[PDB]
Design an enzyme around this catalytic site. Structure first.
Site, PDB file in Angstrom:
ATOM      1  N   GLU A   1       0.842  -1.193   0.000  1.00  0.00           N
ATOM      2  CA  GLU A   1       0.000   0.000   0.000  1.00  0.00           C
ATOM      3  C   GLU A   1       0.877   1.243   0.000  1.00  0.00           C
ATOM      4  O   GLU A   1       2.020   1.210   0.465  1.00  0.00           O
ATOM      5  CB  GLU A   1      -0.945   0.016   1.205  1.00  0.00           C
ATOM      6  CG  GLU A   1      -2.209  -0.828   0.993  1.00  0.00           C
ATOM      7  CD  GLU A   1      -3.341  -0.454   1.935  1.00  0.00           C
ATOM      8  OE1 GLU A   1      -3.144   0.410   2.809  1.00  0.00           O
ATOM      9  OE2 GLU A   1      -4.440  -1.034   1.788  1.00  0.00           O
TER      10      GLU A   1
ATOM     11  N   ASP B   1      -4.021  16.301  -3.859  1.00  0.00           N
ATOM     12  CA  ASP B   1      -4.602  16.504  -5.175  1.00  0.00           C
ATOM     13  C   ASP B   1      -4.562  15.190  -5.940  1.00  0.00           C
ATOM     14  O   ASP B   1      -3.728  14.322  -5.671  1.00  0.00           O
ATOM     15  CB  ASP B   1      -3.844  17.598  -5.943  1.00  0.00           C
ATOM     16  CG  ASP B   1      -4.432  17.882  -7.317  1.00  0.00           C
ATOM     17  OD1 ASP B   1      -5.426  17.234  -7.707  1.00  0.00           O
ATOM     18  OD2 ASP B   1      -3.892  18.767  -8.012  1.00  0.00           O
TER      19      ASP B   1
ATOM     20  N   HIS C   1       2.963  17.336  -9.131  1.00  0.00           N
ATOM     21  CA  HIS C   1       2.474  16.829 -10.408  1.00  0.00           C
ATOM     22  C   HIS C   1       3.593  16.759 -11.436  1.00  0.00           C
ATOM     23  O   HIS C   1       3.720  15.767 -12.161  1.00  0.00           O
ATOM     24  CB  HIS C   1       1.345  17.715 -10.922  1.00  0.00           C
ATOM     25  CG  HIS C   1       0.804  17.292 -12.250  1.00  0.00           C
ATOM     26  ND1 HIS C   1       0.217  16.063 -12.458  1.00  0.00           N
ATOM     27  CD2 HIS C   1       0.767  17.933 -13.442  1.00  0.00           C
ATOM     28  CE1 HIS C   1      -0.162  15.967 -13.719  1.00  0.00           C
ATOM     29  NE2 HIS C   1       0.160  17.087 -14.338  1.00  0.00           N
TER      30      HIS C   1
END
Ligand SMILES: [Mg+2]
Ligand SMILES: [Mg+2]
Length: 739
Positions: free
Chosen positions: A549, A581, A714
RNA sequence: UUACCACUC
């Protein structure tokens, strides 16, 4: 809620629904003997439509009505086949308000019926009108207009959210594309056809159903048979379509789905048109609409609903009535901030863009460049030289000291030549601070090789410059300044900052990258602050490899960030703010209930350390639009507009923020949802902190949509997932090497 | 990579 800002009269794309009933009654049904088919249950409930009334919403075991029936009612019904008697008992369970959370699904079903009776067609989940198709014959395309419409519940009541959406269809059949590829290619046509077909989605116009083809069948033909009956008789019987030629191949979609190509039409914007500019400029002119046109389209839809008596009747059966105009709310315009350079700071202007100011004046921290190498090909000696010249002139105002490069001319533009030359100069000269490479044309493999060497195999900062960018003499000062700023960031410099109003604060941002073939190693980035001014960042990457995980590795990232913060500051953060996000709408409960409490336990490693923490969830793909109410018509809202009521969720504490500048079209804000607020932060402080963090993106002189660390995470995840395919070296993680 | 809003078969 917050009250700081200028009161801005805003308009929305949401239409309020007035409920005239007083309550909705939920009942449970029982079958004796048992009956399994849902259609049989609906048939018995339809015989029992009498008594129970004619307005029913039945799903199989739960019945919704607008009429108050007795506490218990028994009915006897006749079974169709066995000719037996079946007893149906209906009992009250509970009484719901008309605007309850459990009434949304069958209300949406009612609205789907309403829109279907307006002659509209359903492709996917939106409603399109194919009779008003707009044909670009110059491009052989069709734009189908339509709306994406859904009924939702908010703090302010029950609303209908409608947004204008356009669908792109090809005039020519995919058989025609196959024939064209067969014409202009003789031998390799199979591979090119398969390459074109796989990614693209396809429809069938006779039934307006969409399939996603993944493969193409070459051996079977329409003359053959399938599960025993033939294709030709099947189609000429069901629809009477006269097939012209029967030598065509077949199309295979797997969720088999077997489709014909003469009856199949591709969708999506064409691949070739994206690289074209005039084509996309025209298509953008046609598709993106100003606020005035969007409001006009919504008003047209409302007028169309109102002028149709059956559509309105279908809604008033449940005591619902749409209003005649969109909902107008009041928002707040947040106050502006001060952007700080080393010796001067400027009030951010009304445009929220400060490109000139950064280039003019000096930065917070500048790293001198004395040892760096420039690798340029044979045919770019001149432009490269010119570039260096400008880099010497523009450097002075910024306060950077750059020496002449180490010029290295590559004998041929072969990838291995680049790699060998860079590695040789790295080994011989151990002091080079930066490698700058100049590439001819568009070569993505060369970019991948360069960044794989410089980020992973040999940890040096790297920069890539394309010859087209530096070839145009007119635009060379402006691009040189931005290139130099990017190199300064990569070395470990600091460009600008804002005044953070909370003390001993550490900001963490996450974002998740998904492969286009999403069944791959999904990457989760992690960017945290290790400076009191929020100008130094510690960044890590974790992979979603099978049988473990991700939260376990996120704990390691968090504890390492804490240790680095302790090294820099000789203390530990009092407040830790996490911006999560990339999470979808269906995993908010999963993130809030499981992940955040799991992360909170990592703090026990440090003895007697209990940090206050605020956790957000950031969503970019929202369907809400804002308009500014000018005296004349609807215009674009100003940057920095916040909304904290009348469209928020009724479960969490959340707000909508518009922090960037929309050049054309209606503004699309960002939704921030707070799942943990142990620090007891006022809503206004949350809003202003998010707006401030939208200014800290050093790769764009201006405000962006999301907080800076989310964008950095990102970008790091994208680089590590597509280009590197490997975790970056630990040595480079101290600076923003990934810009 | 100068950088960004970009119930079918
Ligand atoms: Mg993202
Ligand atoms: Mg870059």
């Amino acid at each position: 809620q917050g009250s700081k800002g200028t009161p801005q009269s805003l308009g929305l794309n949401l239409i309020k629904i007035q409920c005239h009933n007083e309550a909705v009654y939920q009942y449970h049904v029982t079958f004796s003997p048992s009956v399994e088919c849902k259609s049989m249950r609906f048939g018995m409930l339809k015989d029992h439509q009498s008594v129970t009334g004619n307005v029913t919403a039945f799903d199989g075991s739960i019945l919704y009505l607008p009429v108050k029936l007795q506490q218990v009612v028994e009915l006897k019904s006749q079974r169709k086949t066995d000719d037996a008697e079946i007893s149906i008992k209906i009992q009250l369970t509970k009484i719901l308000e008309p605007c309850s959370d459990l009434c949304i699904p069958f209300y949406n079903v009612v609205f789907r019926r309403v829109m279907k009776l307006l002659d509209m067609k359903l492709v996917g989940r939106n409603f399109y009108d194919p009779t008003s198709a707009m044909v670009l014959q110059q491009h052989r395309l069709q734009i189908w207009p339509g709306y994406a419409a859904s009924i939702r519940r908010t703090d302010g009541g029950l609303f209908l959210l409608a947004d204008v959406s356009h669908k792109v269809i090809r005039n020519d059949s995919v058989l025609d594309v196959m024939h064209a590829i067969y014409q202009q290619n003789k031998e390799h046509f199979q591979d090119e056809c398969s390459k074109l077909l796989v990614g693209s989605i396809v429809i069938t116009r006779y039934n307006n159903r969409t399939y996603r083809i993944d493969d193409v069948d070459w051996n079977k033909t329409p003359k053959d048979s399938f599960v025993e009956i033939t294709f030709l008789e099947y189609y000429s019987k069901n629809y009477g379509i006269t097939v012209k030629e029967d030598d065509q191949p077949l199309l295979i979609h797997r969720p088999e789905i077997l489709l014909l190509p003469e009856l199949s039409f591709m969708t999506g914007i064409p691949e070739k048109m994206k690289k074209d500019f005039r084509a996309m400029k025209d298509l953008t002119q046609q598709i993106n609409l100003s606020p005035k046109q969007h409001h006009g389209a919504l008003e047209c839809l409302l007028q169309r609903i109102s002028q149709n008596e059956t559509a309105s009747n279908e809604l008033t059966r449940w005591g619902l009535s749409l209003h005649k105009d969109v909902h107008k709310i009041e928002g707040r315009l947040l106050p502006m901030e001060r952007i700080n350079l080393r010796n001067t700071s400027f009030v951010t202007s009304e445009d929220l863009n400060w490109v000139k100011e950064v280039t003019r004046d000096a930065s917070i921290l500048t790293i001198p460049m004395h040892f760096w190498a420039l690798f340029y090909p044979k045919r770019a000696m001149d432009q490269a030289r010119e570039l260096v010249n400008m880099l010497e002139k523009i450097a002075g105002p910024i306060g950077m000291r750059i020496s002449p490069p180490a010029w290295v001319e590559l004998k041929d533009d072969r990838i291995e030549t680049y790699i060998r030359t860079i590695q040789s100069l790295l080994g011989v000269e151990g002091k080079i601070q930066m490698v700058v490479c100049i590439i001819m044309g568009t070569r993505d493999d060369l970019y991948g090789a360069i960044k794989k060497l410089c980020c992973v195999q040999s940890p040096v900062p790297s920069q890539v410059i394309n010859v087209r960018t530096i070839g145009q003499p007119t635009r060379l000062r402006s691009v040189a300044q931005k290139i130099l700023l990017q190199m300064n960031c990569k070395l470990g410099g600091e460009l600008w900052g804002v005044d953070i109003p909370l003390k001993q604060l550490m900001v963490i941002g996450m974002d998740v990258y998904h492969d286009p073939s999403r069944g791959m190693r999904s990457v989760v980035g992690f960017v945290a602050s290790i400076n009191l001014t929020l100008t130094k960042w510690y960044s890590r990457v974790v992979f979603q490899m099978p049988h473990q995980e991700i939260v376990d590795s996120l704990k390691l990232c968090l504890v390492g960030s804490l240790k680095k913060y302790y090294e820099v500051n000789h203390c530990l953060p009092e407040k830790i703010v996490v911006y999560r996000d990339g999470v979808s709408d269906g995993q908010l409960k999963t993130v809030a209930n499981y992940e955040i409490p799991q992360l909170q336990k990592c703090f026990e490693a440090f003895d007697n350390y209990h940090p206050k923490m605020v956790v957000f969830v950031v969503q970019k793909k929202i369907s809400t639009n804002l308009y500014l109410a000018a005296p004349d018509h609807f215009v674009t809202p100003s940057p920095g507009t916040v909304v904290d009521h009348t469209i928020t969720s009724c479960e969490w504490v959340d707000f909508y923020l518009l922090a960037h500048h929309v050049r054309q079209g209606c503004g699309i804000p960002t939704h921030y949802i707070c799942v943990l607020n142990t620090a007891n932060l006022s809503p206004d402080h949350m809003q202003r902190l998010t707006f401030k963090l939208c200014h800290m993106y050093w790769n764009w002189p201006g405000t962006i949509r999301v907080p800076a660390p989310c964008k950095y995470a990102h970008k790091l995840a994208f680089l590590s997932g597509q280009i590197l395919h490997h975790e970056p070296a630990i040595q480079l993680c101290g600076n923003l090497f990934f810009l």
